[PDB]
Protein backbone atom coordinates (compact mmCIF):
# COMPACT_ATOMS: atom_id res chain seq x y z
CA UNK A 1 0.00 0.00 0.00
CA UNK A 2 2.78 2.33 -0.99
CA UNK A 3 3.79 3.65 -4.34
CA UNK A 4 7.05 1.97 -5.36
CA UNK A 5 10.14 3.77 -4.18
CA UNK A 6 12.64 2.08 -6.50
CA UNK A 7 12.66 1.46 -10.23
CA UNK A 8 15.50 -0.23 -12.07
CA UNK A 9 17.64 1.12 -14.92
CA UNK A 10 16.05 -1.57 -17.15
CA UNK A 11 12.56 -0.42 -16.18
CA UNK A 12 13.53 3.17 -17.09
CA UNK A 13 15.11 2.29 -20.46
CA UNK A 14 11.88 0.38 -21.34
CA UNK A 15 9.68 3.27 -20.37
CA UNK A 16 11.69 5.63 -22.54
CA UNK A 17 10.81 3.35 -25.50
CA UNK A 18 7.13 2.78 -24.41
CA UNK A 19 5.88 6.03 -22.97
CA UNK A 20 2.65 6.09 -21.02
CA UNK A 21 0.38 8.99 -21.99
CA UNK A 22 -1.86 8.95 -18.85
CA UNK A 23 1.07 8.70 -16.54
CA UNK A 24 3.94 10.52 -18.01
CA UNK A 25 7.40 9.86 -16.77
CA UNK A 26 9.53 12.79 -15.66
CA UNK A 27 13.16 11.91 -14.99
CA UNK A 28 15.03 14.38 -12.70
CA UNK A 29 18.72 14.56 -12.05
CA UNK A 30 19.04 15.89 -8.39
CA UNK A 31 22.81 15.65 -8.12
CA UNK A 32 24.37 17.91 -5.46
CA UNK A 33 27.89 17.59 -4.08
CA UNK A 34 29.69 19.13 -1.09
CA UNK A 35 32.20 21.78 -2.30
CA UNK A 36 35.31 19.75 -1.41
CA UNK A 37 34.47 17.13 -4.00
CA UNK A 38 35.09 19.84 -6.66
CA UNK A 39 32.20 18.71 -8.84
CA UNK A 40 29.63 20.83 -10.76
CA UNK A 41 26.38 18.88 -10.84
CA UNK A 42 24.61 21.22 -13.28
CA UNK A 43 27.52 21.21 -15.69
CA UNK A 44 27.78 17.46 -15.52
CA UNK A 45 24.11 17.25 -16.42
CA UNK A 46 24.69 19.47 -19.44
CA UNK A 47 27.38 17.02 -20.58
CA UNK A 48 25.47 13.77 -19.96
CA UNK A 49 22.06 12.83 -18.64
CA UNK A 50 19.27 10.32 -19.07
CA UNK A 51 17.36 11.15 -22.21
CA UNK A 52 14.52 13.61 -21.64
CA UNK A 53 15.64 14.26 -18.01
CA UNK A 54 15.45 17.65 -16.32
CA UNK A 55 17.84 19.01 -13.69
CA UNK A 56 16.35 19.40 -10.21
CA UNK A 57 18.57 21.86 -8.30
CA UNK A 58 18.11 21.34 -4.57
CA UNK A 59 19.42 24.92 -4.03
CA UNK A 60 16.29 26.22 -5.81
CA UNK A 61 14.03 24.06 -3.66
CA UNK A 62 15.28 25.34 -0.27
CA UNK A 63 14.38 28.11 2.15
CA UNK A 64 17.20 30.64 1.69
CA UNK A 65 15.89 32.81 4.58
CA UNK A 66 17.07 30.10 7.01
CA UNK A 67 20.59 30.37 8.51
CA UNK A 68 20.67 26.52 8.35
CA UNK A 69 21.32 24.36 5.35
CA UNK A 70 19.00 22.65 2.89
CA UNK A 71 15.77 23.61 4.63
CA UNK A 72 12.44 22.79 3.04
CA UNK A 73 10.93 25.65 1.08
CA UNK A 74 7.35 26.61 1.56
CA UNK A 75 4.82 24.84 -0.56
CA UNK A 76 4.17 27.68 -3.02
CA UNK A 77 7.87 27.87 -3.72
CA UNK A 78 8.12 24.10 -4.23
CA UNK A 79 5.08 23.95 -6.49
CA UNK A 80 6.31 26.81 -8.65
CA UNK A 81 9.61 25.06 -9.04
CA UNK A 82 8.29 21.52 -9.67
CA UNK A 83 5.76 22.94 -12.24
CA UNK A 84 8.57 24.75 -14.00
CA UNK A 85 10.28 21.33 -14.47
CA UNK A 86 7.16 20.00 -16.17
CA UNK A 87 5.77 18.00 -13.23
CA UNK A 88 1.99 17.73 -12.78
CA UNK A 89 -0.15 15.62 -10.47
CA UNK A 90 -0.35 12.97 -13.26
CA UNK A 91 3.44 12.55 -13.35
CA UNK A 92 5.44 9.53 -12.29
CA UNK A 93 8.58 11.31 -11.22
CA UNK A 94 11.77 9.27 -11.19
CA UNK A 95 14.78 10.84 -9.56
CA UNK A 96 18.52 10.02 -9.85
CA UNK A 97 21.90 11.54 -9.28
CA UNK A 98 25.41 10.90 -10.50
CA UNK A 99 27.12 10.19 -7.25
CA UNK A 100 29.95 7.75 -6.67
CA UNK A 101 27.73 6.12 -4.00
CA UNK A 102 24.93 5.41 -6.51
CA UNK A 103 22.34 7.59 -4.82
CA UNK A 104 23.24 10.42 -2.60
CA UNK A 105 21.05 13.53 -2.82
CA UNK A 106 18.22 11.99 -4.92
CA UNK A 107 16.51 10.39 -1.86
CA UNK A 108 16.04 13.92 -0.41
CA UNK A 109 14.00 14.90 -3.50
CA UNK A 110 11.92 11.68 -3.39
CA UNK A 111 11.16 12.54 0.24
CA UNK A 112 10.36 16.23 -0.58
CA UNK A 113 7.85 15.36 -3.37
CA UNK A 114 6.08 13.02 -0.95
CA UNK A 115 6.16 15.61 1.77
CA UNK A 116 4.41 18.07 -0.51
CA UNK A 117 1.72 15.59 -1.42
CA UNK A 118 3.06 14.01 -4.64
CA UNK A 119 3.31 10.28 -3.96
CA UNK A 120 3.90 8.98 -7.43
CA UNK A 121 7.63 9.31 -7.22
CA UNK A 122 10.48 6.81 -7.25
CA UNK A 123 14.21 6.63 -7.38
CA UNK A 124 16.49 5.02 -9.97
CA UNK A 125 18.31 2.33 -8.15
CA UNK A 126 22.02 2.74 -8.67
CA UNK A 127 21.67 6.19 -10.19
CA UNK A 128 23.71 7.41 -13.07
CA UNK A 129 26.60 5.27 -12.05
CA UNK A 130 24.61 2.17 -12.89
CA UNK A 131 22.93 3.70 -15.93
CA UNK A 132 26.40 4.32 -17.42
CA UNK A 133 27.69 0.91 -16.33
CA UNK A 134 24.84 -0.64 -18.33
CA UNK A 135 25.80 1.45 -21.40
CA UNK A 136 22.33 2.81 -21.60
CA UNK A 137 21.65 5.81 -23.83
CA UNK A 138 22.57 9.32 -22.81
CA UNK A 139 21.78 12.86 -23.95
CA UNK A 140 23.54 16.16 -23.66
CA UNK A 141 22.23 19.74 -23.36
CA UNK A 142 20.98 22.18 -20.75
CA UNK A 143 17.88 21.39 -18.79
CA UNK A 144 14.53 22.53 -20.15
CA UNK A 145 10.88 21.77 -20.07
CA UNK A 146 7.53 23.12 -20.77
CA UNK A 147 5.82 24.19 -17.59
CA UNK A 148 3.02 22.15 -15.98
CA UNK A 149 0.32 22.90 -13.31
CA UNK A 150 1.47 21.64 -9.90
CA UNK A 151 -0.04 22.07 -6.49
CA UNK A 152 1.71 21.38 -3.15
CA UNK A 153 0.76 21.07 0.49
CA UNK A 154 3.24 20.13 3.17
CA UNK A 155 2.26 17.27 5.45
CA UNK A 156 4.08 18.29 8.72
CA UNK A 157 4.34 14.69 9.83
CA UNK A 158 7.37 14.42 7.41
CA UNK A 159 9.46 16.82 9.59
CA UNK A 160 10.76 17.10 13.08
CA UNK A 161 11.93 20.34 14.57
CA UNK A 162 14.78 21.35 16.85
CA UNK A 163 12.20 21.74 19.67
CA UNK A 164 11.09 18.13 19.06
CA UNK A 165 14.71 16.76 19.12
CA UNK A 166 15.43 18.70 22.31
CA UNK A 167 12.26 17.49 24.09
CA UNK A 168 13.18 13.96 23.03
CA UNK A 169 16.50 13.91 24.91
CA UNK A 170 14.60 13.26 28.13
CA UNK A 171 11.33 11.92 26.70
CA UNK A 172 12.99 9.26 24.38
CA UNK A 173 9.72 8.99 22.48
CA UNK A 174 11.56 8.39 19.22
CA UNK A 175 14.88 6.87 18.14
CA UNK A 176 17.17 9.27 16.32
CA UNK A 177 19.26 7.72 13.54
CA UNK A 178 22.11 9.83 12.10
CA UNK A 179 23.28 9.12 8.56
CA UNK A 180 26.61 11.00 8.68
CA UNK A 181 29.95 9.16 8.35
CA UNK A 182 31.09 7.56 11.55
CA UNK A 183 33.96 9.91 12.15
CA UNK A 184 31.74 13.01 11.93
CA UNK A 185 29.30 11.30 14.21
CA UNK A 186 32.05 10.35 16.71
CA UNK A 187 33.75 13.78 16.58
CA UNK A 188 37.04 12.79 14.90
CA UNK A 189 36.56 13.99 11.29
CA UNK A 190 35.59 17.55 10.20
CA UNK A 191 32.17 18.88 9.37
CA UNK A 192 32.00 20.43 5.87
CA UNK A 193 30.45 23.72 7.04
CA UNK A 194 32.97 26.19 8.46
CA UNK A 195 32.05 27.04 12.07
CA UNK A 196 30.38 23.65 12.70
CA UNK A 197 32.32 21.04 14.61
CA UNK A 198 31.57 17.32 14.60
CA UNK A 199 29.98 15.12 17.23
CA UNK A 200 26.49 13.84 17.73
CA UNK A 201 23.10 14.38 19.39
CA UNK A 202 22.91 12.68 22.81
CA UNK A 203 21.05 9.32 22.60
CA UNK A 204 21.23 9.09 18.76
CA UNK A 205 22.43 6.02 16.81
CA UNK A 206 24.79 6.28 13.80
CA UNK A 207 23.85 4.40 10.60
CA UNK A 208 25.99 6.04 7.89
CA UNK A 209 23.95 6.35 4.68
CA UNK A 210 26.49 4.21 2.79
CA UNK A 211 25.45 1.16 4.88
CA UNK A 212 22.00 1.14 3.10
CA UNK A 213 23.70 0.58 -0.25
CA UNK A 214 25.62 -2.32 -1.69
CA UNK A 215 29.31 -2.20 -2.32
CA UNK A 216 28.52 -0.98 -5.86
CA UNK A 217 25.77 1.50 -4.89
CA UNK A 218 22.58 -0.37 -5.40
CA UNK A 219 19.99 -0.52 -2.58
CA UNK A 220 20.40 -3.43 -0.26
CA UNK A 221 17.53 -5.82 0.03
CA UNK A 222 14.77 -5.25 2.53
CA UNK A 223 16.01 -8.44 4.29
CA UNK A 224 19.47 -6.82 4.64
CA UNK A 225 18.10 -3.42 5.56
CA UNK A 226 16.07 -4.94 8.42
CA UNK A 227 19.23 -6.73 9.52
CA UNK A 228 21.14 -3.45 9.47
CA UNK A 229 18.65 -1.64 11.67
CA UNK A 230 18.51 -4.47 14.13
CA UNK A 231 22.29 -4.82 14.38
CA UNK A 232 22.41 -1.06 15.18
CA UNK A 233 19.77 -1.42 17.96
CA UNK A 234 17.13 0.39 16.06
CA UNK A 235 13.64 -1.05 16.45
CA UNK A 236 11.48 -0.48 13.42
CA UNK A 237 8.30 -1.16 15.41
CA UNK A 238 9.04 2.02 17.42
CA UNK A 239 9.16 5.63 16.24
CA UNK A 240 12.23 6.61 14.21
CA UNK A 241 13.52 10.07 13.13
CA UNK A 242 16.29 10.53 10.53
CA UNK A 243 19.06 13.14 10.76
CA UNK A 244 22.45 13.97 9.11
CA UNK A 245 24.48 17.12 8.33
CA UNK A 246 21.70 19.17 6.66
CA UNK A 247 18.76 16.72 6.21
CA UNK A 248 19.76 15.43 2.73
CA UNK A 249 21.49 12.08 3.34
CA UNK A 250 19.01 11.42 6.26
CA UNK A 251 16.62 10.54 3.47
CA UNK A 252 18.49 7.24 3.00
CA UNK A 253 17.27 6.26 6.45
CA UNK A 254 13.79 7.23 5.44
CA UNK A 255 14.11 5.19 2.22
CA UNK A 256 15.55 2.15 3.95
CA UNK A 257 12.67 2.21 6.49
CA UNK A 258 10.12 2.71 3.68
CA UNK A 259 11.48 -0.31 1.78
CA UNK A 260 11.25 -2.33 5.00
CA UNK A 261 7.59 -1.43 5.55
CA UNK A 262 7.82 1.67 7.75
CA UNK A 263 6.57 4.72 5.89
CA UNK A 264 6.48 7.24 8.73
CA UNK A 265 10.08 8.21 9.36
CA UNK A 266 10.31 12.03 9.64
CA UNK A 267 13.42 13.99 8.82
CA UNK A 268 14.97 16.37 11.32
CA UNK A 269 15.43 18.95 8.59
CA UNK A 270 17.65 21.25 10.64
CA UNK A 271 19.97 18.30 11.22
CA UNK A 272 23.49 18.67 12.71
CA UNK A 273 24.12 22.17 11.38
CA UNK A 274 21.11 23.49 13.22
CA UNK A 275 21.59 21.29 16.22
CA UNK A 276 25.24 22.44 16.69
CA UNK A 277 24.33 26.13 16.13
CA UNK A 278 21.47 25.98 18.64
CA UNK A 279 23.31 23.78 21.18
CA UNK A 280 24.23 24.19 24.85
CA UNK A 281 27.46 22.36 25.67
CA UNK A 282 25.57 19.30 27.08
CA UNK A 283 24.10 18.80 23.64
CA UNK A 284 27.30 18.03 21.79
CA UNK A 285 28.77 14.56 22.33
CA UNK A 286 32.22 14.36 20.73
CA UNK A 287 35.60 12.58 21.02
CA UNK A 288 37.00 15.91 19.78
CA UNK A 289 38.13 18.63 22.14
CA UNK A 290 36.39 21.93 21.62
CA UNK A 291 37.97 25.43 21.50
CA UNK A 292 36.43 25.95 24.87
CA UNK A 293 37.88 22.68 26.29
C1 LIG B 1 24.25 17.65 1.92
C2 LIG B 1 25.10 17.47 3.12
C3 LIG B 1 25.69 16.27 3.32
C4 LIG B 1 26.41 16.07 4.48
O1 LIG B 1 27.03 14.99 4.69
N1 LIG B 1 26.49 17.07 5.32
C5 LIG B 1 25.94 18.27 5.11
S1 LIG B 1 26.08 19.56 6.25
C6 LIG B 1 25.62 20.96 5.31
C7 LIG B 1 26.81 21.45 4.53
O2 LIG B 1 27.94 21.00 4.78
C8 LIG B 1 26.63 22.43 3.41
C9 LIG B 1 25.39 22.59 2.80
C10 LIG B 1 25.15 23.55 1.81
C11 LIG B 1 26.19 24.34 1.32
C12 LIG B 1 27.46 24.28 1.87
C13 LIG B 1 28.46 25.11 1.38
C14 LIG B 1 29.70 25.01 1.99
C15 LIG B 1 30.02 24.08 2.96
C16 LIG B 1 29.06 23.26 3.51
C17 LIG B 1 27.77 23.30 2.95
N2 LIG B 1 25.21 18.48 4.00
NA1 LIG C 1 17.77 20.83 6.09
NA1 LIG D 1 33.78 22.56 9.90
Residue numbers in the entry: 5 to 297
Authors' text:
Hydrogen sulfide (H2S) plays roles in many physiological processes in mammals, including relaxation of vascular smooth muscles, regulation of inflammation, and inhibition of insulin signaling. More recently, it has been proposed that sulfane sulfurs, i.e., sulfur atoms with oxidation state 0 or −1, existing in the form of polysulfides (H2Sn), glutathione persulfide (GSSH), glutathione trisulfide (GSSSG), cysteine persulfide (CysSSH) and so on, actually mediate some of the reported biological activities previously thought to be regulated by H2S67891011.
To our knowledge, this interaction is novel in terms of both the long distance (>3.45 Å) and the orientation of the persulfide bond (almost perpendicular to the aromatic ring of the inhibitors). Direct hydrogen bonding by R188 and S250 and water-mediated hydrogen bonding by E195 and R197 are commonly observed with compounds 1 and 3. In addition, compound 1 forms water-mediated hydrogen bonds with D63 and H74. The thiophene ring (compound 1) and naphthalene ring (compound 3) exhibit cation-π interaction with R197 and parallel stacking interaction with the salt bridge between D73 and R19726. Gas-phase calculations indicated that the interaction of S–S− with pyrimidone is strongly exothermic (10.4 kcal/mol; CCSD(T)/aug-cc-pVDZ), which is not inconsistent with the experimental ITC measurements (ΔH = −9.37 and −11.76 kcal/mol for compounds 1 and 3, respectively). We concluded that the interaction is predominantly due to electrostatic attraction between the persulfur anion and the positively charged carbonyl carbon of the pyrimidone structure. The side chain of R197 of h3MST is positioned inside the active site and forms a hydrogen bond with pyruvate, whereas that of m3MST-inhibitor complexes is directed outside of the active site and forms a hydrogen bond with D73.
